[PDB]
Structure 1
């Protein structure tokens, strides 16, 4: 009769799917609550500058 392309016939899946996703690259920036300076300035008086 004739020939047929492979895609012309319905394909049923005989495979089991596993969707493994990678862990994304991340960056940590320098973060701090109070800098060394802020702590120095927190004092009411400084002997050196006085």
Structure 2
């Protein structure tokens, strides 16, 4: 068999899922400061009851 047809190949672009990605979370940013003022306050205001 010979053919008079001209081929053409089209495959659909497959699905692709995007997972959530973060370089730094806000908890790491809150921990970036050398002294979280709030936690220092809460610790130091327990001295009499401790």
What TM-score range do you get, normalising by the shorter chain?
0.7 to 0.9
Aligned length: 40
Higher percent of residues as helix = 2
TM, length-normalised to structure 2: 0.76
TM, length-normalised to structure 1: 0.76
Structure 1: unaligned runs, 5 residues or longer:
1-10
Using CA pairs below 8 Å that are at least 6 residues apart, which structure has the higher relative contact order? 2
**RMSD of the alignment, in Å?**
0.6
* Shift >4 Å, 4+ stretches: none
Structure 2: unaligned runs, 5 residues or longer:
41-50
Question: Which protein has the larger Cα radius of gyration, Structure 1 or Structure 2?
Answer: 1
